[PDB]
Scaffold this active site. Structure first.
Site, PDB file in Angstrom:
ATOM      1  N   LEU K  42       0.979   1.954  -4.388  1.00 14.96           N
ATOM      2  CA  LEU K  42       1.046   2.975  -3.355  1.00 14.96           C
ATOM      3  C   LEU K  42       0.705   4.323  -3.981  1.00 14.96           C
ATOM      4  CD1 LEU K  42       4.322   1.799  -1.601  1.00 14.96           C
ATOM      5  CD2 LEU K  42       2.008   1.472  -0.791  1.00 14.96           C
ATOM      6  N   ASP K  43       0.881   5.387  -3.207  1.00 17.06           N
ATOM      7  CA  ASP K  43       0.719   6.730  -3.737  1.00 17.06           C
ATOM      8  C   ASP K  43       1.783   7.622  -3.110  1.00 17.06           C
ATOM      9  OD1 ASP K  43      -0.453   6.581  -1.250  1.00 17.06           O
ATOM     10  OD2 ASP K  43      -2.003   8.063  -1.689  1.00 17.06           O
TER      11      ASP K  43
END
Ligand SMILES: CCCCCCCCCCCCCCCCCC(=O)OC[C@H](COP(=O)([O-])OCC(O)COP(=O)([O-])OC[C@@H](COC(=O)CCCCCCCCCCCCCCCCC)OC(=O)CCCCCCCCCCCCCCCCC)OC(=O)CCCCCCCCCCCCCCCCC
Ligand SMILES: CCCCCCCCCCCCCCCCCC(=O)OC[C@H](COP(=O)([O-])OCC[N+](C)(C)C)OC(=O)CCCCCCCCCCCCCCCCC
Ligand SMILES: CCCCCCCCCCCCCCCCCC(=O)OC[C@H](COP(=O)(O)OCCN)OC(=O)CCCCCCCCCCCCCCCCC
Ligand SMILES: CCCCCCCCCCCCCCCCCC(=O)OC[C@H](COP(=O)(O)OCCN)OC(=O)CCCCCCCCCCCCCCCCC
Ligand SMILES: CCCCCCCCCCCCCCCCCC(=O)OC[C@H](COP(=O)(O)OCCN)OC(=O)CCCCCCCCCCCCCCCCC
Ligand SMILES: CCCCCCCCCCCCCCCCCC(=O)OC[C@H](COP(=O)(O)OCCN)OC(=O)CCCCCCCCCCCCCCCCC
Ligand SMILES: CCCCCCCCCCCCCCCCCC(=O)OC[C@H](COP(=O)(O)OCCN)OC(=O)CCCCCCCCCCCCCCCCC
Ligand SMILES: CCCCCCCCCCCCCC(=O)SCCNC(=O)CCNC(=O)[C@@H](O)C(C)(C)COP(=O)(O)O
Lengths: 170, 178, 53, 221, 62, 55, 459, 99, 126, 76, 88
Positions: K42-43
């Site tokens: 993810l970020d």
């Protein structure tokens, strides 16, 4: 009823007889009958017992009328005895006039509440008495200071009499 | 509320805070869930298409004009959670959060009403009294000679002792002491 | 002196009794116009020495 | 944990409100008036650990205090010109240019019923509990100024200026508070501004020579 | 930065940036949590005006 | 009732409107609380201190 | 009157002859009994004033002040008992002697029928207050406070002495009743204007104007609790009593000579209420509130209306009681925390529930609440002032608004809010100080129940 | 510096006497001072004094003035006199200055 | 379409231009302020949860604020023509204004009473 | 179950003060209230009468309530 | 009456429920000790959205600094427990 109608006038009540044109029972009449039988009868019995005890131990109290001392007008200035007696009887009359004014105000309020919607018409004599007593109170005790005195009241009356006499010249 | 703020916010932090605040105000505008999901996906797409810039000045100018747009068209009455600042029931139970040292001032009758609890409380006070000196020694031994010192605190380093300054946040009142 | 010890509790009551006595002495000191005011000036009654003591 | 204190506070508010409603002289009217104000302060600042609740209670005290200034002006004038403080002599002073007393009573009614100029305490002052909001600021306390004006309606009918400014003030506050209630999100705020709008409607009805319709709307509302 | 010697008796007391306590970070726990101010921080001259019970200077949407 | 139902169905419609000063004026209570409760306490308290006490 | 003065005189040998473990108990109990004895001159059936002696006299004005003084002496003993516990026995007995001498001299001052004896007892009361403030005050500024208090009073009182001797040389007697009866009008000259100023400015210093008032907050801040109590509850009223007494021989020229002081009083009550709003010290706040209430009293006595005099007497007694109550509550917090900073102790309603109840009732008495003699006095003063001029209602309304604001600000900022949890040394309560609050508040309730006693000369 | 005692800490008074009443350090003098203050301050002066003040009769002639005003109003009404004559003093016994 | 701040409703930290044109000097100043805040926080926390503490915490910052507001103003007051004018107007202008208000009102009332055009309708107790 | 100890201040001293204050106030006032009730029920409430035959009454004979007459006779 | 108390198991189950309904990740791969960027891919925007979903799930707001400190479902659960005073 220590009070009398001569000093606290009250017109006789004219209540109309009921005309129950409906077939429904009246909860007001039922509740008043039950209220009498439940509350009014024991309270009446207690008060009758209390009045019987008072009649057993009955005692009396009186009024203490004061007689008229010589006033401020008929004795010399600087005499503190006559000035003291005149000042005390003037303060006595001042307090009596305060309660006369209170009596008239109570009478006016009773007239207004009794007549209700017709207070502008049939309270004419109560309002007239209130206005006349107000005018007399303003003539005798109004402009006197917080140190109001028989001497100050006499000075105000003498000034008013001088003005009235001067106006009566022309 | 549990982590102390640093000296400054980085650019990534400022962008993330703006993103969260923009999503919250977007929800407050479009109340309905499907409409909110649609416009939140649009907002995420805008952040993704300005994501990779490789120019700090351009990124900062983008952030500045985005904050300008947010302040231009924010919701004047945004949704605030309860038990959050500005919302209803924020400081509601502070009148019931009694700070726990009044049990020292409790009468012996009242202490006798709860005997086991006060035995456990006495044990806790003994633990705090024994741990305080090692807490102070660890804080003095923490390598902060001069200059940069943050508001963070160390844990229990050796075996058997407690994290320094633990009492005021371990024995804090419950969030609903009712 | 049978009780003794805390004897000081009669000090303020003694002062109160002495103050009442001094007020009575001042009333006896004034004594002028016993019935000579224009307000009261009543008869001396068949069995009565003075109006007020 | 203070539910007994809460119930006692509600009972004390009810006692002061019934004193204010059934009072015959303006002094007892003032006793009920200010007792209602003080119990309002306490019940708004029920959660005394909440700074916003304390501010709401304080500003309710402030606006009701300006209303008290108007009330005191009317009371002092009536004492000086009709030496009774009683509604019967107040009736007997029905035709002697009661501009100063009626303006003071209008200021008092503006303060209590939260008309325009002295309105925002009523919507701000329900960060307290919901039964407090209901009983105090929806049915009984905020009625009090309109009740005062319908009590002094026989003086009010002979002053055209007071009637016109009551009508204008009530119309302005009902429009403004309906406008504020339109785009609102908190339910208590919506119903508070609705209450202010209905109080403005009662003030309009008092601006006409219909006090009895205003009292009917008091009970209905 | 002290006051500019403009008459009344401000001594060496600092000129704090004249913002109310509403604008402090409300999630951060303060030593004086109601005052939103830490221990040892310089008190503003008008702290009485600028407490959360009183005058607000927080930015508005309009 | 009909006008407000139509406006609420317009809120159901999937599009962002442009914020209007009438709507901001209504939702910020006519700006009366903000303006008055910030200018009257500030002037009153500042005058009270800076004249009555310390001057 | 001697039946009240002499037991209070015998309080001093009781104080110095009691055992050190029984001194407070004995003196407090016998001073309570002396107050009960001092309740006996409320038996006023006739309109005649009770003239007990050729030098002592009673009055519907003097009687509430005497009863308040005799009631306040045991309250001062109770309040000052705790902060003298680590003290020498000789110093404790000397402090009790100072309080008892204050009570004796004030009873003699209020019951004195001669203006020169009133002046003598006035300065005689000036002495032990100075000794109390300077010797048992806490901070450094007690010496400055004593200097300010003493010489404000003395520079006021010297022209009063000159005026009294002038009146005695003119009329021959300087007795209050003889002056009241054979009072003479003044021919409106500059000498008579200066005579009016000389006989007024002593009492206008003693109860604070907007001008000379600077000694009152200093003395109240630096004084101990008994000194603040006696000052704020008797001595300002002593100035007011002197003004009511001496205003009778200045009949024709008060009606224009009272103009600057009425304006000074009204604008000063506004400014001092404003100071109470932006005040950082609790005792300073209570002191400036006292300045505002006494400004109301000054305006009423100057306008010289029967409503004004009655309201002045009611505000005198009510303000004495409620200011002593507020000072005692502030002193309880100060004995907990050893600091008078108002913003420092904040959430005290949490730990002190009934003390918060006493705070709430004291502030509701501080503002005018209609079932209270405070509102009775303030409302009748307002009525008399509006009769004097209709435009005074603006100043009255501003004062009432700011009064409510500082009273509720006091309650909210010192009782409500989040509790300052770092203050470990918050002992629960003393039965002594809770009793002290109750003995302040219950007479307020009883005088509200029967306010005919507090009504003064005029009605 | 001079040879001065430091500032003493204030002891928790309830640490040694949990029934402390505010008056004195040792319990016996404390409880007897509490009892003396309550008995002489609430029992015999706030109750007996209240009763005495309540049963002071005719306080400054109020009830007497009520009865006298009722008597005078009744007399002047049944005798047709002008109730509350405008002038206090009789004009015949007042001599006005000439011209 | 721009937010204009004021002394009331000031400028946000998301809108001020100084937040975006940052300098290493400002970064160092911010780090130093954080260090001062952290040192004071550490001292307060040690004094706060010290178990041997039997009293409150004295707060010398609050003591300084109270002393500066109370006992420092006259030692650091210097008379200038500006504050002399301010003191004169604030201490005399309201007095003279209300003097003329009450004097004109009472003179008008006295003249009306003396010429008889003012009547006290039922004013018995004044 | 799951009952948790709610932390409260020491209310013992407050309750003790209220109990003691009510105790002493009751300890004298309740006999006084009972005496007032008994006096008003059984005796007193003098009835107004005219002055007879030139009799000179005592000063307490001008007062109404029996307690007022008793105090005026025995103390004034 | 109202508001049943929440336990550690309920908090863990609800957090895992929301993360399994994320639909961006976790094809029967999520655990309680899975990092959002290290092993979930993810970020920062995804983590902010996850925090927003947790706030909307539990009805209370996580402040921004603590929220960006949170990076794993285990410490999300620990944060909810510390805020709500769970395991009394
Ligand atoms: C002759 C023709 C020309 C006259 C002329 O040019 O007059 C200018 C002169 C003002 O001179 P300036 O240019 O301001 O002087 C500045 C200095 O050169 C440079 O300033 P500086 O800082 O070097 O000086 C320090 C300080 C030097 O320190 C002082 O001046 C100390 C303060 C002196 C008194 C200030 C009064 C005002 C404040 C009152 C506060 C409230 C009081 C209670 C209410 O100077 C000042 O404060 C300047 C103003 C001085 C005013 C002097 C007034 C004297 C007459 C006072 C009469 C009574 C007043 C009421 C008393 C009430 C008592 C109960 O006067 C006027 O303009 C009006 C007054 C006219 C006479 C009346
Ligand atoms: C604390 C307040 C201080 C300021 C206000 C003090 C009062 C101000 C007004 C009065 C004048 C000054 C006081 C005079 C006292 C005696 C008054 C009197 O008897 O008047 C009638 C007398 C007149 O006597 P007479 O009335 O018998 O005159 C004869 C009149 N015929 C012939 C018609 C019968 O007035 C004086 O004699 C006044 C002389 C004053 C001389 C001394 C002045 C000193 C300085 C003045 C201020 C002093 C106080 C302040 C000091 C500084 C403080 C910082
Ligand atoms: C067509 C006809 C139209 C007619 C229109 C007539 C209009 C008349 C208007 C008269 C009244 C105007 C002034 C009202 C001031 C009210 C100030 C107030 O209550 O402020 C409250 C405020 C806190 O509230 P806030 O900040 O909103 O809430 C925070 C929660 N988020 O702040 C505070 O609580 C601060 C604490 C108080 C500070 C001291 C205040 C002293 C005020 C003294 C005023 C003296 C003069 C009064 C004049 C009255 C005239 C009627
Ligand atoms: C005089 C100078 C004083 C200076 C300070 C003195 C301090 C020390 C005092 C020592 C004791 C002295 C007491 C003085 C007051 C006595 C009160 C009293 O008993 O008054 C008599 C009154 C009945 O007398 P009556 O003639 O009917 O009254 C006038 C009617 N025309 O009796 C009654 O009505 C009965 C009163 C007692 C019964 C209980 C009353 C309870 C009242 C509850 C009120 C609740 C609301 C309070 C609100 C407060 C708000 C702030
Ligand atoms: C502080 C404010 C002081 C100023 C207030 C405003 C001016 C008041 C002026 C004043 O008192 O006027 C009353 C009177 C008017 O003149 P008149 O009644 O004719 O008296 C002639 C005097 N032989 O004028 C006089 O009687 C003149 C003397 C007035 C003295 C006032 C008191 C002294 C100053 C106290 C400060
Ligand atoms: C009796 C007491 C008399 C006191 C007389 C004092 C006169 C002072 C005149 C003066 O110089 O006023 C200066 C004042 C402000 O000017 P300044 O000091 O330069 O300050 C700049 C910021 N306003 O200037 C002003 O405030 C201008 C006022 C214009 C009207
Ligand atoms: C245990 C503690 C005490 C408990 C007391 C319980 C009852 C309290 C009753 C309170 C009654 C109301 C309060 C006010 C009463 C005032 C009475 C008074 O002083 O009256 C004056 C009168 C003067 O004497 P006189 O009557 O003129 O004599 C000639 C005959 N006509 O004087 C007299 O007639 C004589 C005095 C009568 C009242 C005496 C009160 C003394 C109080 C101070 C000393 C207390 C000493 C400790 C207790 C000792 C108990 C033996
Ligand atoms: C109410 C409605 C409010 C509307 C607000 C609309 C604002 C939207 C406008 C934008 O999205 S412009 C965003 C500008 N931000 C950037 O350019 C940041 C780019 N710099 C970076 O380092 C980025 O890679 C990131 C995203 C910050 C790094 O984060 P990674 O996910 O760890």
């Amino acid at each position: 009823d220590s009070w009398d109608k001569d000093v606290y006038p009250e017109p006789p009540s004219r209540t109309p007889a009921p005309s129950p044109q409906t077939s429904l029972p009246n909860p007001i009449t039922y509740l008043t009958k039950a209220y009498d039988l439940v509350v009014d009868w024991p309270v009446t019995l207690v008060r009758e017992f209390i009045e019987r005890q008072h009649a057993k131990n009955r005692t009396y109290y009186y009024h203490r009328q004061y007689r008229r001392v010589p006033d401020i007008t008929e004795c010399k200035e600087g005499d503190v005895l006559c000035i003291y007696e005149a000042e005390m009887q003037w303060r006595r009359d001042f307090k009596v006039d305060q309660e006369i004014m209170n009596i008239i105000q109570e009478r006016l309020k009773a007239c207004q509440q009794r007549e209700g919607e017709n207070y502008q018409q049939n309270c004419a004599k109560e309002l007239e008495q209130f206005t006349k007593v107000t005018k007399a109170y303003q003539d005798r005790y109004l402009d006197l200071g917080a140190y109001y005195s028989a001497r100050k009241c006499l000075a105000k009356q003498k000034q008013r009499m001088l003005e009235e006499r001067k106006a009566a010249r022309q | 509320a549990f982590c102390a703020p640093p000296a400054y916010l980085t650019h990534q932090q400022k962008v993330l805070r703006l993103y969260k605040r923009a999503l919250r105000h977007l929800e407050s505008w479009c109340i309905h869930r499907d409409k909110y999901r649609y416009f939140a996906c649009l907002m995420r797409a805008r952040f993704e298409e300005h994501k990779n810039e490789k120019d700090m000045m351009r990124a900062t100018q983008l952030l500045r004009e985005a904050e300008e747009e947010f302040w231009q068209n924010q919701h004047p009455q945004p949704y605030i959670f309860p038990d959050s600042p500005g919302g209803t029931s924020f400081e509601r139970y502070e009148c019931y959060k009694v700070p726990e040292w009044c049990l020292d001032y409790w009468h012996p009758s009242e202490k006798a009403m709860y005997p086991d609890y006060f035995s456990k409380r006495e044990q806790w006070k003994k633990l705090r009294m024994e741990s305080w000196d090692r807490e102070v020694k660890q804080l003095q031994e923490e390598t902060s000679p001069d200059g940069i010192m943050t508001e963070a605190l160390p844990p229990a380093r050796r075996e058997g002792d407690l994290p320094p300054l633990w009492w005021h946040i371990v024995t804090r009142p419950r969030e609903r002491p009712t | 002196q049978l009780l003794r010890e805390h004897w000081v509790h009669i000090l303020v009551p003694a002062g109160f009794v002495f103050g009442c006595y001094l007020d009575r002495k001042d009333d006896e000191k004034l004594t002028a116009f016993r019935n000579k005011s224009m307000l009261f000036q009543r008869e001396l009654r068949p069995n009565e020495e003075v109006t007020w003591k | 944990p203070n539910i007994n204190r809460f119930i006692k506070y509600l009972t004390l508010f009810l006692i002061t409100m019934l004193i204010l409603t059934s009072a015959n002289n303006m002094f007892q009217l003032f006793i009920g008036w200010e007792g209602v104000g003080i119990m309002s302060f306490l019940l708004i600042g029920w959660w005394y650990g909440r700074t916003d609740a304390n501010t709401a209670a304080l500003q309710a005290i402030l606006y009701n205090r300006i209303g008290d200034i108007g009330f005191i002006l009317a009371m002092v004038w009536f004492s000086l010109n009709m030496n009774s403080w009683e509604l019967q002599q107040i009736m007997f002073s029905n035709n002697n240019d009661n501009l100063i007393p009626l303006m003071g009573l209008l200021i008092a009614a503006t303060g209590k019923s939260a008309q325009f100029g002295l309105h925002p305490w009523l919507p701000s002052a329900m960060e307290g509990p919901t039964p407090v909001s209901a009983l105090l600021h929806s049915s009984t306390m905020v009625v009090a100024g309109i009740f005062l004006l319908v009590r002094f309606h026989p003086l009010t009918t002979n002053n055209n200026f007071i009637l016109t400014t009551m009508l204008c003030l009530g119309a302005l506050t009902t429009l403004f508070t309906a406008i504020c209630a339109l785009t609102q999100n908190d339910i208590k705020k919506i119903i508070a501004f609705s209450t202010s709008s209905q109080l403005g409607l009662m003030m309009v009805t008092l601006g006409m020579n219909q006090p009895h319709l205003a009292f009917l709307h008091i009970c209905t509302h | 930065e002290p006051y500019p010697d403009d008459g009344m008796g401000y001594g060496d007391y600092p000129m704090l940036p004249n913002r109310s306590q509403h604008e402090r970070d409300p999630w951060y726990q303060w030593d004086h949590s109601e005052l939103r101010m830490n221990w040892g921080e310089p008190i503003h001259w008008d702290l009485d005006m600028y407490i959360r019970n009183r005058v607000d200077t927080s930015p508005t949407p309009v | 009732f009909l006008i407000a139902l139509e406006l609420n169905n317009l809120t159901m419609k999937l599009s962002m409107n442009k914020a209007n000063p009438y709507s901001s004026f209504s939702t910020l209570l006519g700006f009366f609380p903000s303006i008055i409760h910030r200018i009257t306490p500030m002037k009153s308290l500042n005058l009270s201190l800076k004249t009555s006490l310390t001057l | 009157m001697l039946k009240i003065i002499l037991p209070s005189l015998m309080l001093l040998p009781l104080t110095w002859l009691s055992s050190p473990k029984k001194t407070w108990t004995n003196v407090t109990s016998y001073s309570f009994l002396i107050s009960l004895t001092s309740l006996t001159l409320l038996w006023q059936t006739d309109e005649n004033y009770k003239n007990f002696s050729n030098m002592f006299s009673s009055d519907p004005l003097s009687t509430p002040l005497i009863i308040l003084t005799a009631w306040l002496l045991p309250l001062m003993l109770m309040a000052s008992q705790n902060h003298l516990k680590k003290d020498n026995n000789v110093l404790q007995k000397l402090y009790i002697s100072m309080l008892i001498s204050l009570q004796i001299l004030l009873i003699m001052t209020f019951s004195a029928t001669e203006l020169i004896m009133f002046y003598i007892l006035f300065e005689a009361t000036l002495i032990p207050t100075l000794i109390i403030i300077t010797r048992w005050g806490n901070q450094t500024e007690r010496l400055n406070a004593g200097i300010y208090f003493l010489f404000y009073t003395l520079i006021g009182s010297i022209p009063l002495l000159i005026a009294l001797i002038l009146i005695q040389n003119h009329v021959g007697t300087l007795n209050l009743m003889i002056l009241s009866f054979t009072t003479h009008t003044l021919d409106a000259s500059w000498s008579n204007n200066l005579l009016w100023l000389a006989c007024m400015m002593a009492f206008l210093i003693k109860m604070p104007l907007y001008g000379v008032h600077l000694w009152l907050p200093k003395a109240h801040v630096e004084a101990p609790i008994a000194g603040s109590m006696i000052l704020a509850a008797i001595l300002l009223k002593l100035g007011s009593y002197g003004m009511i007494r001496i205003s009778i021989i200045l009949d024709p020229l008060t009606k224009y000579m009272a103009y600057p002081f009425i304006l000074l009083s009204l604008w000063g009550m506004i400014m001092t209420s404003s100071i109470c709003l932006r005040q950082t010290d609790l005792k300073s706040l209570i002191a400036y509130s006292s300045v505002s209430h006494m400004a109301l009293v000054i305006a009423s006595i100057m306008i010289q209306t029967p409503w004004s005099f009655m309201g002045a007497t009611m505000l005198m007694i009510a303000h004495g009681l409620t200011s002593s109550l507020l000072f005692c509550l502030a002193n309880s917090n100060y004995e907990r925390i050893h600091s008078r900073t108002m913003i420092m102790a904040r959430g005290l309603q949490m730990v002190f529930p009934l003390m918060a109840t006493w705070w709430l009732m004291a502030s509701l008495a501080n503002l005018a609440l209609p079932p209270s003699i405070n509102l009775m006095g303030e409302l009748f003063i307002t009525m008399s002032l509006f009769s004097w001029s209709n435009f005074t209602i603006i100043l009255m309304g501003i004062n009432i608004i700011i009064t409510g604001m500082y009273s509720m600000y006091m309650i909210i900022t010192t009782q409500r809010g989040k509790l300052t949890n770092h203050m470990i040394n918050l002992q629960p309560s003393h039965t002594r100080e809770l009793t002290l609050m109750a003995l302040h508040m219950i007479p307020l309730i009883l005088l509200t129940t029967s306010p005919k006693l507090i009504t003064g000369l005029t009605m | 510096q001079w040879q001065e005692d430091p500032e003493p800490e204030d002891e928790n008074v309830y640490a040694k006497n949990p029934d402390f009443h505010g008056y004195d350090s040792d319990p016996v003098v404390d409880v007897w001072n509490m009892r003396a203050v309550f008995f002489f301050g609430f029992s015999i002066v706030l109750v007996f004094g209240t009763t005495f003040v309540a049963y002071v009769p005719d306080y400054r002639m109020q009830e007497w003035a009520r009865r006298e005003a009722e008597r005078l109003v009744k007399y002047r009404e049944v005798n047709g006199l002008p109730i509350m004559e405008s002038n206090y003093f009789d004009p015949s016994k007042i001599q006005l200055p000439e011209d | 379409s721009k937010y204009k701040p004021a002394p009331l409703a000031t400028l946000p930290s998301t809108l001020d231009p100084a937040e975006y044109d940052v300098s290493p000097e400002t970064r160092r100043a911010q780090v130093e302020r954080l260090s001062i805040r952290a040192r004071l926080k550490r001292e307060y926390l040690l004094q706060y949860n010290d178990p041997k503490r039997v009293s409150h915490i004295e707060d010398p910052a609050l003591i300084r604020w109270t002393y500066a507001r109370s006992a420092n103003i006259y030692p650091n007051f210097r008379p200038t023509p500006k504050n002399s004018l301010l003191g004169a107007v604030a201490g005399f202008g309201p007095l003279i204004f209300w003097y003329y208000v009450f004097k004109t009102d009472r003179d008008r009332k006295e003249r009306l009473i003396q010429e008889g055009k003012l009547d006290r309708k039922f004013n018995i107790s004044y | 179950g799951k009952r948790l100890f709610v932390v409260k201040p020491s209310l013992y001293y407050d309750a003790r003060f209220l109990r003691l204050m009510k105790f002493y106030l009751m300890l004298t006032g309740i006999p006084v209230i009972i005496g007032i009730t008994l006096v008003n029920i059984f005796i007193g409430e003098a009835e107004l009468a005219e002055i007879p035959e030139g009799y000179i009454p005592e000063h307490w004979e001008y007062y109404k309530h029996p307690i007022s007459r008793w105090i005026a006779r025995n103390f004034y | 009456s109202d508001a049943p108390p929440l336990t550690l198991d309920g908090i863990k189950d609800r957090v895992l429920y929301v993360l399994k309904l994320y639909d961006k990740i976790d094809p029967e791969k999520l655990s309680v000790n899975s990092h959002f960027m290290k092993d979930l891919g993810l970020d920062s925007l995804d983590q902010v959205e996850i925090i927003m979903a947790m706030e909307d799930e539990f009805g209370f707001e996580i402040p921004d600094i603590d929220a960006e400190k949170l990076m794993c479902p285990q410490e999300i659960v620990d944060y909810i427990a510390d805020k709500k005073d769970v395991y009394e």
